[PDB]
């Protein structure tokens, strides 16, 4: 039940903080490029 | 040899404080009993006098002159120099905020600059207090 | 220093001749360290950080940490107590 401890902060700052999808896309594209090299 | 006195009250006459900081118009300066001779115009701020003994003094001053000659004789002349205790921090903040409010009121460039002098003096007062 | 070292050596010799304790384990730690140096421990890049970093930590603890304890107790606690 640690979710409710920072639940307000989570959606309070991730409206733009939770853009880790961009990081995941960049990492996946880099891994695909390296596998093409691999 | 420190000569610090207002037009009405005298703080130090020939005192070997050997360390005085003044709120100069251009900025801040520090006397070290050997500082290069110069003439410095005071700015709204506080003069923290550091005596040769470990004790120091803090006086908020008005505009004036910092005259340090080739020798150690420094004639600091402040128009309205008082200790910080005599002032009121609450009145300080109130005057600062009122002056900030009235800064745009003075349409004249000279008058707005005068109110800017007022807000600068109040900000230095707030920092000192 | 040197005089204290002779006194400590005499005290150890007195315990060494008899017991005066429940099988002092300091010799055990010394022997374990010697065996580790002989077989397990490898003296490679040890002086790099194993000695230097620990020495810096020792200097910090024997130095400013005494004042840090004061800065904790006599400053943090008493402030909220007074408040």
């Amino acid at each position: 039940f640690q979710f409710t401890g920072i639940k307000k902060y989570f959606n309070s700052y991730t409206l733009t903080g939770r853009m880790n999808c961009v990081l995941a896309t960049y990492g996946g594209i880099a891994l695909l490029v390296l596998y093409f090299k691999l | 040899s420190f000569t610090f006195a207002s037009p009405t009250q005298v703080f130090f006459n020939g005192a070997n404080v050997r360390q005085v900081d003044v709120p100069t118009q251009t900025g801040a300066f520090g006397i070290l009993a050997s500082h290069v001779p110069t003439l410095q115009v005071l700015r709204p701020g506080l003069v923290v006098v550091h005596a040769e003994d470990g004790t120091t003094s803090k006086y908020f001053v008005s505009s004036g002159s910092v005259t340090v000659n080739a020798d150690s004789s420094v004639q600091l002349l402040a128009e309205e120099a008082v200790t910080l205790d005599m002032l009121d921090p609450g009145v300080a903040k109130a005057n600062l905020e009122k002056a900030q409010s009235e800064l745009l009121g003075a349409a004249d460039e000279a008058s707005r600059a005068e109110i800017q002098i007022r807000i600068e003096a109040n900000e230095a007062l707030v920092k000192a207090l | 220093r040197l005089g204290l070292i002779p006194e400590e050596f005499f005290q150890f010799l007195y315990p060494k001749t008899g017991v005066t304790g429940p099988y002092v384990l300091g010799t055990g730690l010394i022997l374990y360290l010697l065996s580790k140096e002989i077989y397990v421990i490898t003296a490679e890049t040890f002086s790099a950080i194993s000695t230097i970093g620990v020495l810096v930590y020792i200097v910090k603890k024997y130095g400013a940490s005494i004042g840090a304890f004061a800065d904790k107790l006599n400053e943090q606690k008493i402030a909220q107590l007074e408040e």
Binding site: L15, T16, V22, L23 | - | E44, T45, S47, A48, G53
Partner: protein, 215 residues
């Protein structure tokens, strides 16, 4: 001739370890070891919140956790055989991009037009306007990579220098005076290597400046 190795062990246990170093008691009076942590948190929070002075101060309660985490991870690396998680480029890359994206998207969420207008430095010569615009946008896109590298490179370089000088000392079976001098150099360097905390300050302060500029 010893090959330096910033190996990759099971990362999760090592990375989670600095968190356990800070206990949080639910008492009016702390344990005189969390108390110093609380005082440091307050002292740094005042410095970080001084500049913002906006509704973005909500971000400060997360930036405090960020600075604490980076400092704890980097300070623990000074141990003999500690593996710095920040040595690997992966996690710092995964930290720099999301936070910069958060800053720019927060800027584009409120007063979006003026946020993009921050490229204009209030006029400037019109003859060089396109050059200034392309320069500043390339700098803005550079900023995440810059933030990641300015941490990764020097965090790795500290360990690299420590390893090099330590190997020099170990291989120096010659005159013991030179060995002692090199060991003194090692200790001086490690005292300087304790300034990795200043690197934490630089990273977090640059992030704060970016967020304040865009919000």
């Amino acid at each position: 001739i010893a090959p330096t190795m910033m190996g990759l062990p099971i990362v999760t246990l090592i990375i989670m370890f600095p968190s356990l170093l800070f206990p949080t008691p639910k008492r009016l009076i702390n344990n005189r070891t969390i108390s110093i942590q609380q005082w440091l948190i307050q002292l740094t929070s005042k410095q970080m919140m001084a500049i913002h002075n906006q509704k973005g101060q909500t971000w400060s309660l997360m930036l405090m956790s960020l600075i604490m985490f980076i400092g704890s991870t980097n300070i623990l690396g000074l141990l003999p055989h500690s593996f710095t998680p920040t040595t690997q480029l992966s996690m710092n890359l995964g930290m720099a991009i999301p936070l910069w994206s958060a800053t720019v998207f927060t800027g584009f969420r409120y007063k979006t037009k003026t946020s993009l207008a921050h490229f204009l430095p209030q006029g400037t010569p019109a003859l060089l306007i396109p050059m200034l615009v392309i320069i500043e946008t390339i700098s803005l896109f550079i900023q995440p990579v810059a933030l990641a590298v300015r941490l990764t490179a020097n965090i790795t370089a500290g360990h690299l220098l420590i390893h090099l000088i330590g190997g020099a000392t170990l291989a120096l079976l010659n005159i013991n005076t030179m060995t002692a001098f090199i060991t003194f150099t090692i200790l001086i360097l490690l005292t300087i290597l304790e300034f990795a905390v200043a690197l934490i300050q630089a990273y977090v302060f640059t992030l704060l400046v970016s967020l304040y500029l865009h919000d």
